């Protein structure tokens, strides 16, 4: 998709996990967007949840454990995209 920055911003659910990355040697700052649903699914899977229970809307800041889950996903995503 090609669109102005504001159009992309307005479609992002609040709150959302936004990670800043740099594609060296090119100048700028890239973004990796993870939806809260994906983070909740990953947390549920990593802690033995079977996924039967539907996710509930929270609109809350991610916990530090969820932050570490997001970082674990982010490292693999970064390696994959770099490759």
């Amino acid at each position: 998709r090609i669109q102005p920055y504001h159009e992309f911003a307005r479609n992002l659910p609040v709150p959302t996990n936004l990670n800043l990355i740099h594609l060296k040697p090119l100048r700028g700052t890239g973004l990796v967007v993870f939806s809260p649903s994906l983070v909740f699914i990953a947390v549920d899977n990593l802690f033995g949840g079977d996924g039967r229970f539907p996710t509930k809307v929270e609109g809350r800041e991610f916990t530090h454990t969820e932050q570490r889950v997001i970082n674990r996903m982010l490292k693999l995503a970064l390696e994959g995209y770099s490759d």
């Binding site: 909740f40 947390v43 549920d44 990593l46 802690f47 033995g48 949840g49 079977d50 039967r52 229970f53 509930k56 809350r60 916990t63 530090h64 454990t65 969820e66 570490r68």
Partner: protein, 315 residues
């Protein structure tokens, strides 16, 4: 090695003896010995004899006349400085993983701490926590969160070791200055003691204000202020008036549940024939449940309060 000698000793003393010894050993030592035991294939006669000789030589030294240090210390402290000081000193003497640390914390604080987490994480922590502590924590949660946690616990399938380690590290990071958490100083009972030390007019004001507030703890303090065992310090005429105002069966049950000094005081306050009949009925009857005795004592204390308010009894 010493571990191998201990393993041989445990094998050769019998299953019951080794099981009894493991009850006196820590988890790490039991695990290490069991791991060593499962790898044992042969124990030669020379090794067996050397192990027996070394164990007997060690036991000749001790021969330590092992004493239950906790129980003996508790009894000594109780008989020396009363129950309160003994319990305080034991608590001082008695006083880790993040989950284990949370088990050593106050229910509301831990509940609010894990409340800011994913419900599956909450359920996993509660499963890893103590059952009583988890039940206390869950009682403080909202209905929706409580139901979600109960549903998740009913479908718990285990957690990866890496996720467990990360959760433990996060819980350790979230810890605060929990050293010497909480403190047993007083409250309610101390308030009742202070009220008992304040004037008659002041205790009138006290009845007034306590009735005025929540009312529930007011009645709790009504019960708390003065006890049945304190009847021994009352004058004889008041005890006789209580005998007049108390049914024979209730008085008999209360004396059965009370101490011999109070029972003898009540019997002295009674007439000779009535006291003899009461003693005969006590002997011919059987044991009474604690709840019934407590209820009869509560009724007798209500009668005591009624008589004291009217001025017929001095407390």
């Amino acid at each position: 090695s010493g571990t191998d000698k201990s393993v041989i000793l445990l094998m050769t003393i019998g299953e019951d003896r080794a099981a009894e010894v493991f009850k006196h050993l820590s988890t790490r030592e039991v695990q290490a010995l069991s791991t060593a035991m499962a790898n044992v294939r042969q124990i030669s006669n020379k090794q067996l004899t050397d192990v027996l000789s070394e164990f007997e030589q060690e036991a000749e030294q001790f021969a330590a006349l092992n004493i239950n240090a906790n129980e003996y210390l508790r009894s000594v402290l109780v008989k020396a400085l009363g129950e309160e000081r003994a319990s305080s000193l034991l608590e001082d003497i008695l006083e880790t993983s993040g989950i284990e640390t949370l088990n050593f914390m106050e229910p509301q604080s831990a509940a609010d701490l894990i409340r800011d987490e994913h419900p599956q994480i909450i359920a996993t922590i509660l499963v890893h926590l103590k059952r009583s502590q988890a039940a206390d924590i869950l009682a403080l949660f909202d209905e929706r969160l409580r139901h979600d946690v109960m549903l998740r616990i009913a479908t718990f399938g285990g957690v990866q070791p890496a996720a467990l380690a990360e959760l433990t590290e996060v819980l350790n990071g979230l810890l605060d200055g929990q050293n010497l958490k909480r403190s047993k100083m007083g409250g309610v009972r101390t308030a009742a003691e202070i009220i008992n030390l304040m004037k008659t007019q002041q205790e009138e004001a006290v009845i007034t204000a306590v009735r005025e507030f929540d009312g529930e703890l007011a009645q709790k303090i009504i019960d708390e202020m003065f006890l049945f065992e304190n009847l021994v310090d009352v004058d004889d005429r008041s005890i006789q008036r209580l005998l007049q105002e108390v049914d024979s069966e209730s008085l008999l049950i209360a004396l059965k549940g009370a101490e011999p000094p109070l029972r003898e005081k009540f019997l002295r306050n009674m007439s000779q024939r009535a006291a003899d009949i009461l003693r005969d009925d006590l002997a011919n009857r059987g044991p009474v449940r604690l709840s019934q005795v407590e209820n009869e004592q509560k009724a007798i204390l209500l009668i005591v309060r009624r008589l004291a308010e009217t001025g017929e009894m001095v407390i």
